[PDB]
Subunit: 487 residues, 4 copies
Amino acid sequence: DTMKVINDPIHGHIELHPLLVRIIDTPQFQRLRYIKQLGGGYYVFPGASHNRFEHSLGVGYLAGCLVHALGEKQPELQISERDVLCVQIAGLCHDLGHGPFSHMFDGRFIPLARPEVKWTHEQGSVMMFEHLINSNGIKPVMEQYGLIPEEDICFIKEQIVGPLESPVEDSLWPYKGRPENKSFLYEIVSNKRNGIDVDKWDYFARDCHHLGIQNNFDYKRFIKFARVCEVDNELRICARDKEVGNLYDMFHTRNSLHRRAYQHKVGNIIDTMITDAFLKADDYIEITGAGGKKYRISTAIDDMEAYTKLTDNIFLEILYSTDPKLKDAREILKQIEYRNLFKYVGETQPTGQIKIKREDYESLPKEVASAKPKVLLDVKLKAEDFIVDVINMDYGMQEKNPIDHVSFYCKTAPNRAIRITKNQVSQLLPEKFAEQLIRVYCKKVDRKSLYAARQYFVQWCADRNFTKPQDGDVIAPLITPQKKEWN
Amino acid sequence: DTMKVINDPIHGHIELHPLLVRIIDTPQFQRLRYIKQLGGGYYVFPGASHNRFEHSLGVGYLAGCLVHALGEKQPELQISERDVLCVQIAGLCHDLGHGPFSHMFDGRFIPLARPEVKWTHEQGSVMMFEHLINSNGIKPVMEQYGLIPEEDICFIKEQIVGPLESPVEDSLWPYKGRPENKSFLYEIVSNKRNGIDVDKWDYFARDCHHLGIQNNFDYKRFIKFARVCEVDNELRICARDKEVGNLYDMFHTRNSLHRRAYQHKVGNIIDTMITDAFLKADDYIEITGAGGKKYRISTAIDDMEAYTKLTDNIFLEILYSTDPKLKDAREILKQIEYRNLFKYVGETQPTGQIKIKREDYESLPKEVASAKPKVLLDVKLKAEDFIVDVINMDYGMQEKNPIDHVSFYCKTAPNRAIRITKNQVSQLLPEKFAEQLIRVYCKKVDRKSLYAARQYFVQWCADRNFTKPQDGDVIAPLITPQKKEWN
Amino acid sequence: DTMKVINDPIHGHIELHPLLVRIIDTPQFQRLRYIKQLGGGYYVFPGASHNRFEHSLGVGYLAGCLVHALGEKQPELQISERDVLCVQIAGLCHDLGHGPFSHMFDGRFIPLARPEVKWTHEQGSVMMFEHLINSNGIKPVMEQYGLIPEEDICFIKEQIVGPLESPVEDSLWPYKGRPENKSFLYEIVSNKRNGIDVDKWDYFARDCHHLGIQNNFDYKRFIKFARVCEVDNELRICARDKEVGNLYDMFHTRNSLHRRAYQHKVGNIIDTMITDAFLKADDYIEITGAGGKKYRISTAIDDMEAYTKLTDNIFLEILYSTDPKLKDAREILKQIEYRNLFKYVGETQPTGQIKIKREDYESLPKEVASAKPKVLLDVKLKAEDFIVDVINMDYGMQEKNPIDHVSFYCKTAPNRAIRITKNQVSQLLPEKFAEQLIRVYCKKVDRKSLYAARQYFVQWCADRNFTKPQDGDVIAPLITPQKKEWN
Amino acid sequence: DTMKVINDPIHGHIELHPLLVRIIDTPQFQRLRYIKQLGGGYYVFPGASHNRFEHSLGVGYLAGCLVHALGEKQPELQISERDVLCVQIAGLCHDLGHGPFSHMFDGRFIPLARPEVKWTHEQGSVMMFEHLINSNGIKPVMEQYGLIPEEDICFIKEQIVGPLESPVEDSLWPYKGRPENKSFLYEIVSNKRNGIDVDKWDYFARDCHHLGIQNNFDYKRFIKFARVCEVDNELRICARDKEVGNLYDMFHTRNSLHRRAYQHKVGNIIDTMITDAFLKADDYIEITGAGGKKYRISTAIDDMEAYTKLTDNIFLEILYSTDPKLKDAREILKQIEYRNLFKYVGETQPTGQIKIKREDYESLPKEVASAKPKVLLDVKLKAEDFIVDVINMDYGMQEKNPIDHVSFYCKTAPNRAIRITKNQVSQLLPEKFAEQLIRVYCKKVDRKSLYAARQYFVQWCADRNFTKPQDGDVIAPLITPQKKEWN
Ligand SMILES: Nc1nc(=O)c2ncn([C@H]3C[C@H](O)[C@@H](CO[P@@](=O)(S)OP(=O)(O)OP(=O)(O)O)O3)c2[nH]1
Ligand SMILES: Nc1nc(=O)c2ncn([C@H]3C[C@H](O)[C@@H](CO[P@@](=O)(S)OP(=O)(O)OP(=O)(O)O)O3)c2[nH]1
Ligand SMILES: Nc1nc(=O)c2ncn([C@H]3C[C@H](O)[C@@H](CO[P@@](=O)(S)OP(=O)(O)OP(=O)(O)O)O3)c2[nH]1
């Protein structure tokens, strides 16, 4: 088992340990080779045709590079090859469990297919990791390369998802993967304290390189300016005190990428319509589970033998199906094929301090259809013809500043960690880190319906004291004069 | 129908005419959205996950740009918007007909599935264009935008494939798409005289950008240094006389891309094994054709209603199939999934002026198994365990210099065209433009079989007076001393 | 006079009109070939070795591209080749007048060498343009290519500097370069209404490409999404309504470039010390003016015959001089050569609404030396050993939002212009657009002096109720506990 | 003395050892900050404004990276930090001695200013290194960081120039810098056996990045595929056997860069004219040497105190000089300023196996003026009005294949080195590695003189049986019919 090298386009050549090569060369990992990282973005950005396989390889490589650099800079941390291999394995296998198209399954399909279950892709990745290890017989190979599987597997699971048995909430680090003195290893692959991790850097670089946008972050500079320092009696990764501006720039880059590509109108509506097609085709798609069992699309997240075959393939299954049962879903997919998409109406910005929770997402069309515009409307619409899409823009921490939970070190004292407040960096920084934006769409493709939907949406926005739409004075100029505050 | 813009990663923003938008928004074009441009290269280069949809859009955009620039530079050519739209449509719809994985279907699957038929992807693209036009009702829209479909469609077909009714061979341009004075329009999308066309530039740029290699060509400089000049009583596109070095560099870049990425050992063997899986699964895959007819994978190239659904999907059809009939093909695909690939043995270079034709491709394993090495071999192999792979490296014209069929103009006389010979450019240019290289693989994964196959291959190479393999003195050092000429 | 092409690294190939070729091939333009765009940044960023010649060529090319695109999109604007040539000439000759190192001369050297005169580089560019035209005999060539010099020269001067004879302040556009209907041509090269112009885009791209930072702006998308629309009875260039986020991103990119490269600590101190060397060497450097007159460095801005030879050369004049008169300046330059720079002390942020004006810049060291820290200091410092450096960070408009003066158009009404407020875009935008930051340096290189200067600076910051320094708890931990508000 | 980091645009962030920081922060190294790497290329490619300072830093960084990687891969080589520091210092100080504009001084100015002396820039770099060490007192610092100056300085000199005392020619490595077992350290900075070294990679990347051309080489892949293997009883750096194609591509990239940018027509003529200006201004420029001595431009290569101040500054010295003695040189420089360059005539290719040596370079204009064309010429020219420019294109080894002196290793035997012949790689490789091309220019700018010079040049080419010029049938169509072999 000789070391293997791959020519990645973002990170050049990547060297992979033989244990990593054995882990990737399994069906549970090659399943990621057929899942798009940007599901609905491929139908808006033609170049965004990259899967999660490359992203997983890159995240593993970056985690290995960061841990190797941290070990080289501070030999006193006692970082062994076992820790390097474990953090690399956590990096590669952090996205093992993803549904088709990789985001609507986790955030739109499952919440509608089965709202009772609470499912997230990290849990699916953990279960797929267990299935991979058990099915492929990886533990002998792990023991061959100096790894202790009984605790290394727990360490990898804790890296991927966090505290396994229960939330900590007591006992002062009752963890079972690594001791207290290795507390800096729970932040390399998925940092749950401030969000700065190699996963963010990798998808930043890859998405910018593929979409056609330019990236405004340099992870190598952060790597060269990061040191492990004792913070409140545990070792946390700390950055140089002059890098706070670059960290704010990283979060601004995340916000801009979400604004421009991940929350596109057409991409969001296409994801919604593919989700509707999946919901309509759920009852007639059967996936062979374990021991000959048959599983639906929505129920395949309970058996990883079936979930291994639940990839982007079901889209072309429905599209090419001749079964009359799947007719409605096939028609929806063909409407997508003809770009007969649902029509955009408008956006808004809630202004009150209270934001609408996910429990009220489906009640919005009812209120939208209840509007009573004082304009000559020749057609009356129904909530069935209205679609709302609530989007939350944040910095990884909803209401809290992610930089407020970062520790910095200076040149004079390379081992003392300090906190830098927002006002000590610049006065040209965002005053808020959470905002909400609501889209509204129409399912009809006739101009009269478009006019009626626009009037209803503008009247609804004016009713609940929402923001003035960016083009409220053109599409519906008969309602804005009523809103005195808007002018 | 307002003009639409797409954010391509290679060409930035691209503006599309409403007729183009109508042409692309059809199932026959979105079928390209699910066909990888590099079939087996995705399993060697992780980043090469780009389809033919983006490539078609880019080729159309580049054809439009080139024709617009040529029209602007020389207003006397009388280039109308009709010609621009026609060349753009030829650019977008030049790769409509591609099989799954886009290259093994055209060059490996069909020649083995049905050797009697002579099929090429240009013919399939022509038939898919006909089907698109007829099914989607494009002719009224073409007439709406000033196009004459009866001759414009013939012009587009001639652009894609060439002379439709028969080879010219007489009558001095009996063509029916465009008059003699527009002879320079048959070279923008697919140049069949010297090979310089926007298709080459687009896949150069895209493949370099995605694989991870750097490109050594600048198409914008060629565009700025190209003029239409009368050549032997027809108008041909001519380049500046100082660009001959850059053209040779373009062909060298093509050769290097073929050498490094398109002819990779692992990619070629993976394509061969997927082709074998398709051949084994042919008899049990049915695609619903026109009017309820059922078509196989190999017979779906006779009905474009069925061929519209023959994409990369059949790979995951076979892989995820529970049908016991498809068991052998499923096992082959799972062997691919486990990276239990066939093992590399060696390469060679024919030295005689006579190269082995495609008619003798399948007879090579018989001669390979017939070798009698004078070494202690404990296992005897069979031709069934041997795979050969003949690769032809050329410049687009097999034995002829492509630059020998290019006309150049100078600054003093911007309308007189001249020919530049090879010796007038440099003495550091290739003396030959055609070479052949033969790979040999083994289907067994035991070291004894590897040793036996290596000995057989080395003895076969020494028997027929072939070149000494690049590592013939290490893998098999007991045979090279016999070859006196090799040392 | 045939059209010429140059291979720029940022904009690829650039085609230049013969009038432009004649204008550039003069000493007054090649003088820019020896003036660094980033004066003190070359001694911090090794790659920033680009002059103003390339920047001028790029700005001219971008102005030509923008005007050509605007003319093509709207033929009703009646844009002739005369306007294209005039805006191009304004683009190339917008930075003709720059001092050595191009920024300290305009903003640091002249205000200290002769505070009485009010001089800016635009005035010098105007006078150099006049001198170029008169000396090289350009007017016959301008008349040869259809330009009317008597008004075209006035138009170019108005583009470079604005209203020539007097501020408008009345008469409703009494301009003498172009009529009212061409009001959109005063914004292509140097936009004085909102700051969006090709100069910003060009130095963005070039500085990012040379420093080593990545750019977060796409000017081509803005070009494709810009239209001329009547605004308050004059034609102004308007952007698409969906581009407000990208415009805010452009201003954020400007802020980040200023923060990271243009306001660097070492670069600023090196510029200050080179300015001091120039001030000390002023009295002994003579430049031959017009008619044999002799001019100093500071007085050469009154005669463009002398100013044509006042480039970055005087740095090496002083450095290599054997004249004992220039000894002090030579010693300062050699101290720069040995990197025996003045030592950094700290930075601060004024918190009061009132900012300190440039009239009080030199009075700050007096107040700094007057501090009385309650720490054991064994050495007392003087204001002569203290250097302050006030930096203003803005968006091009000091206290005003630059986007508040931009007009937008929508797809439904491509000719009606609207205003978009900040709250209608996002709640994650800066609440302020002006901030001030003050650096402090020490001229001595002994650690005791460093400690004393740090204590004095921290006490001064605590005295005037300034912000807490980002490392006030380490370099001087004995003063921060006194500031209760800081903790 | 803490480690310092610089943000290079090509290599990102570079970490520098404190000894390196002390070595660079001297006048003898900052002298490179004002010497253009491409002298005459800056007046053809506007973006090529990069000096030798960045190139030296990059070469040092790449040498350090290569040696560190080689040490990490093979711990048995016993590579200490002393060797790393020594190879880094050799990398930074490999181009210390360069004349103004960095190439015409070494290859055109000195051979004409003083043909008796044999001077090369490596000797000047060695003497500048000696002067730097002695003047700045570096030896105590070298001893502080574990370096043995008496032998380390000899090792660095041997790296820069080779055998110091005498050519080896006997004694089987009588070297005095490093023992026989460290023979692989004489190839990292300047490889004199096959030419593959970090200097080539660095200027490849930097020149491509600045000119505007795209690079076709990846040095990181070569670094990852390079191992030290015993070859003929000494340790040489060997590459992977599959990298022979990439090495040939590297040499092809060098050839293309020379063809397109380093041997440009206008750049070469501008370098020639600046050399002529220097030759005319030699007698009136005095540089203060050591102990008050005065040195000319040509005689400043005998005293490094004077040579430290001989940079690109003398160009602006001559250009801005008011001394009537320098009038002719000032006029030549102003002719350059006005782009009144000498006019191009044509190029040729010698066909005989014997090439014309440098001893006959100045005799060519005499033979050119002696031509007797059989055309109606109204003006007779003189050899004084003719300029020839002989250019040699090679692969770093004049008549020999550089890859013929490279050793390769395979995966099966990572310690046995083998030789790969050209015919074992491809049949599409150059058959010759040396070619010669001769340019001819005219000093007059009247069309009649241009016609006369073109006729004379074409007749001269036809006389000596040279190649047919690429445009011999247009500029002079009355002579080519005489040359029967040319048609
Ligand atoms: N570089 C870039 N930045 C962005 O901010 C951005 N947003 C989209 N795109 C890409 C996505 C596509 O590839 C392309 C078109 O996006 P457009 O949003 S202008 O298109 P429609 O949805 O039709 O908007 P309209 O309401 O005017 O009809 O640009 C972008 N590309
Ligand atoms: N990318 C690129 N490749 C090349 O091969 C090349 N050669 C030059 N340039 C750059 C150098 C300049 O920046 C620009 C113009 O070079 P041009 O050689 S077309 O110009 P003239 O010398 O005037 O040739 P003419 O005989 O027709 O007048 O292109 C090049 N740029
Ligand atoms: N990419 C990049 N981003 C930045 O924000 C930045 N700032 C500087 N540089 C470049 C400029 C140089 O090329 C390099 C070093 O800059 P550094 O500011 S870390 O160095 P010192 O001034 O010595 O800071 P210290 O106070 O720790 O001693 O990085 C930067 N490079």
